[PDB]
Amino acid sequence: MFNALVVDKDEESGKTQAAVKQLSLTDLPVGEVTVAVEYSTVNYKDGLCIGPGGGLVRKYPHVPGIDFAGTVENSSDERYKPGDKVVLTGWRVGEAHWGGYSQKANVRADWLVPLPEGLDTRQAMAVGTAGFTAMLAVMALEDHGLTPGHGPVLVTGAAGGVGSVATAILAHLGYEVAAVTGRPETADYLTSLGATQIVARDEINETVKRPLESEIWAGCVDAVGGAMLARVLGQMKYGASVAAVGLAGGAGLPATVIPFLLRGVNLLGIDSVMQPYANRLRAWERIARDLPMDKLEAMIRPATLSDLPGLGADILKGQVQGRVVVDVNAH
Amino acid sequence: MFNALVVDKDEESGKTQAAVKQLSLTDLPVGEVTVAVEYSTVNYKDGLCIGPGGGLVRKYPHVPGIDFAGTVENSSDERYKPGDKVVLTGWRVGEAHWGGYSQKANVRADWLVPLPEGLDTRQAMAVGTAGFTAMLAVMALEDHGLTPGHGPVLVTGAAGGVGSVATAILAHLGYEVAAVTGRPETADYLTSLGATQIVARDEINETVKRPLESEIWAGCVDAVGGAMLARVLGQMKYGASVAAVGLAGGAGLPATVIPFLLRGVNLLGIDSVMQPYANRLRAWERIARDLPMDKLEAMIRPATLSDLPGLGADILKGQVQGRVVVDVNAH
Numbered sequence: 001m002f003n004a005l006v007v008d009k010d011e012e013s014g015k016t017q018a019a020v021k022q023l024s025l026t027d028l029p030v031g032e033v034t035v036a037v038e039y040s041t042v043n044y045k046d047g048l049c050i051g052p053g054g055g056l057v058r059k060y061p062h063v064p065g066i067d068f069a070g071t072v073e074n075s076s077d078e079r080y081k082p083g084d085k086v087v088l089t090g091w092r093v094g095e096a097h098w099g100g101y102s103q104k105a106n107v108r109a110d111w112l113v114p115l116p117e118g119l120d121t122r123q124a125m126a127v128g129t130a131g132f133t134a135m136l137a138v139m140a141l142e143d144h145g146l147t148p149g150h151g152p153v154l155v156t157g158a159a160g161g162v163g164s165v166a167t168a169i170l171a172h173l174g175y176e177v178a179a180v181t182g183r184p185e186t187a188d189y190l191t192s193l194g195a196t197q198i199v200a201r202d203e204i205n206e207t208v209k210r211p212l213e214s215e216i217w218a219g220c221v222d223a224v225g226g227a228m229l230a231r232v233l234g235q236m237k238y239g240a241s242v243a244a245v246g247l248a249g250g251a252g253l254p255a256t257v258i259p260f261l262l263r264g265v266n267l268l269g270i271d272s273v274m275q276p277y278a279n280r281l282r283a284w285e286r287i288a289r290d291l292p293m294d295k296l297e298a299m300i301r302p303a304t305l306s307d308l309p310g311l312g313a314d315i316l317k318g319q320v321q322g323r324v325v326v327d328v329n330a331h
Numbered sequence: 332m333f334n335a336l337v338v339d340k341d342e343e344s345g346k347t348q349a350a351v352k353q354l355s356l357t358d359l360p361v362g363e364v365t366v367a368v369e370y371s372t373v374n375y376k377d378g379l380c381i382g383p384g385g386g387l388v389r390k391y392p393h394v395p396g397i398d399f400a401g402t403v404e405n406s407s408d409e410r411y412k413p414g415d416k417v418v419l420t421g422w423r424v425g426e427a428h429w430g431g432y433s434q435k436a437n438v439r440a441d442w443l444v445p446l447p448e449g450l451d452t453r454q455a456m457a458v459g460t461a462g463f464t465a466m467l468a469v470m471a472l473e474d475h476g477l478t479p480g481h482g483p484v485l486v487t488g489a490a491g492g493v494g495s496v497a498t499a500i501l502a503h504l505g506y507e508v509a510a511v512t513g514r515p516e517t518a519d520y521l522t523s524l525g526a527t528q529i530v531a532r533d534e535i536n537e538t539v540k541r542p543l544e545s546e547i548w549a550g551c552v553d554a555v556g557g558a559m560l561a562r563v564l565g566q567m568k569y570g571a572s573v574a575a576v577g578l579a580g581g582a583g584l585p586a587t588v589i590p591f592l593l594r595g596v597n598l599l600g601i602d603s604v605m606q607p608y609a610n611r612l613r614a615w616e617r618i619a620r621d622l623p624m625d626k627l628e629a630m631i632r633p634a635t636l637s638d639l640p641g642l643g644a645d646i647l648k649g650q651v652q653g654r655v656v657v658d659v660n661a662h
């Protein structure tokens with residue numbers, strides 16, 4: 001038997017409760033590949049799935065965890081064999097299927113990628129869906145012409161996961177990064193990741209009447225969404241793009257079309273969950289080359305399975321800095 | 332001397348009036364190239380500049396007309412000589428500079444393009460800024476992977492200028508075009524342009540509470556904006572893009588970020604006004620080959636300078652079908 005975080009739901013009271021429980025291999029959903037999980041992480045979406053559900057969890061009891069990395073234990077698919085090091089992010093794992101908050105997980109072979117060279121399984125989860133998506137966002141901006149030397153690139157919710165990794169990647173690629181944070185005490189941390197400007201949240205997180213403000217930003221990786229995204233759109237330089245990643249400041253987008261029509265601004269939707277295998281490989285290879293591992297290390301907050309209920313609540317309140325690494329085998 | 336539409340403003344009352352007046356060459360702003368205008372057209376923006384101003388006209392009296400096509404009369408720039416056929420769209424002509432509603436116009440040589448071999452000056456204005464921007468929008472969709480055979484392409488405000496040209500181009504390129512109109516009597520016209528489905532405006536011009544509806548549209552050329560655009564975003568297929576062109580339905584964008592985040596949808600801002608010379612040439616050559624001239628002909632509504640005050644008022648009310656061609660030399 002082995003340990004896993006299991007969320008139960010009482011339909012009478014609606015109450016969800018997460019707790020570490022002991023499971024057997026026959027408790028997992030049937031799957032092509034059984035992975036001995038070494039690490040997982042805590043993404044914003046994991047906080048939803050650990051706690052209230054956010055409408056993302058269709059079946060209880062539920063083992064959350066949209067990410068894991070580990071070593072293949074058994075496989076009926078010729079792409080993977082015992083001993084292979086593999087990485088899972090997304091594919092609705094941790095939402096519609098039991099996930100990485102477990103010492104063992106069963107998955108479709110289509111859902112895995114090989115552990116990218118340059119990362120161990122710990123670092124792969126230090127990156128996580130959050131860091132993987134920051135890379136996708138940077139790639140989207142590059143695809144639309146972003147190059148260094150043309151003004152600051154805005155990173156919103158910068159003290160969090162997506163924001164920390166995007167800051168580190170963009171700084172390493174030679175960009176001037178303006179980091180937006182509601183936690184001013186993280187400035188030194190953000191500067192150590194490579195940020196060149198620190199922007200207070202309350203300077204940019206409300207809409208204004210004017211549909212256009214001055215052109216400031218050469219591009220943006222947005223983990224916040226909401227009214228902040230609406231405001232940022234009116235501050236983009238001509239032809240610049242926003243990579244839309246997050247909704248931590250709200251799902252509503254109270255925008256105007258004026259920045260798009262008058263300045264050729266783009267709003268580029270970034271979905272990590274259903275990325276094709278080939279682009280997953282591409283983004284992970286970019287991560288191994290362009291995310292300095294010493295910068296990644298500075299983001300890591302260690303945790304165990306027993307820490308997940310509290311960390312899930314913390315991340316939804318915006319109180320997790322950097323990137324949690326869950327050692328599902330600790331002790 | 333020569334005829335032109337002149338708009339005057341009473342700066343006390345703020346009211347404007349437009350009428351045909353007789354001007355001399357020295358009434359025009361100084362310019363590098365004097366063009367004997369043959370045709371202009373009526374764009375939505377021209378309706379603003381003919382009438383209330385829309386905040387776009389810095390100086391009165393004003394000769395409006397953001398577009399013209401005609402024959403060079405004199406030039407101090409080696410790029411153009413007397414007899415050359417030339418096309419002007421945008422570059423703030425008709426807004427910050429006297430424009431095409433005149434038998435003669437002075438312009439910077441930077442602002443012109445040579446008339447494509449496949450268009451005459453009448454056809455170039457039947458296309459106009461509206462049709463030129465429709466082509467830019469199609470090009471943006473193709474640059475983001477739009478190809479035929481992957482679902483209908485939505486064209487909003489289809490009975491108008493942008494919409495009519497987008498419908499005809501997309502249909503000729505092999506797409507199934509869904510044409511959104513608030514004028515149901517234009518259905519047969521839209522079908523004659525190549526539309527395969529007719530969508531009533533009131534079916535799609537309100538927001539809904541659900542942030543995602545079913546995936547339907549392979550792409551969209553949007554002349555309407557407003558709540559219609561917000562609704563359309565939740566109906567785009569995974570990875571599909573909206574080319575944002577217009578705001579005829581309102582400048583506000585009461586959207587959510589959910590289609591961007593969960594479906595990788597893109598909102599791509601199209602600006603015709605300041606397109607670089609090289610891209611203008613490519614768009615015009617695309618127009619010459621991808622817009623059937625008999626389809627364009629079915630869009631044309633002939634006009635003279637004296638018709639412009641009424642047509643400017645009409646287009647702002649959504650009451651112009653197709654593409655006005657103004658013969659500034661009519662007898």
Ligand SMILES: NC(=O)c1ccc[n+]([C@@H]2O[C@H](COP(=O)([O-])OP(=O)(O)OC[C@H]3O[C@@H](n4cnc5c(N)ncnc54)[C@H](OP(=O)(O)O)[C@@H]3O)[C@@H](O)[C@H]2O)c1
Pocket residue numbers: 042043044045129130133156157158159160161162163180181182183201205223224228244245246247248249250270271272273315316317318319320322592593
């Ligand atoms: N589209 C995808 O595939 C994809 C992949 C990963 C994440 N996402 C989304 O991206 C967002 C970030 O994920 P994450 O794991 O990095 O979570 P996170 O660590 O909590 O990052 C979010 C940051 O946003 C800021 N923030 C929180 N609440 C805010 C508010 N009300 N107003 C303004 N800023 C606020 C906080 O940073 P500061 O303290 O620095 O202000 C917070 O740390 C989430 O919404 C998540 O769902 C989507």
Ligand SMILES: NC(=O)c1ccc[n+]([C@@H]2O[C@H](COP(=O)([O-])OP(=O)(O)OC[C@H]3O[C@@H](n4cnc5c(N)ncnc54)[C@H](OP(=O)(O)O)[C@@H]3O)[C@@H](O)[C@H]2O)c1
Pocket residue numbers: 261262373374375376460461464487488489490491492493494511512513514532536554555559575576577578579580581601602603604646647648649650651653
């Ligand atoms: N970004 C650029 O560079 C650029 C270039 C050209 C045009 N634009 C803009 O694109 C839009 C269209 O220009 P246009 O010259 O083609 O004008 P247009 O001929 O009047 O076309 C607009 C069409 O939109 C529909 N419409 C009007 N009011 C509406 C409303 N309240 N709700 C829903 N639909 C409405 C009408 O079509 P139906 O009768 O079929 O419903 C109308 O004919 C304008 O907003 C214009 O400013 C921008």
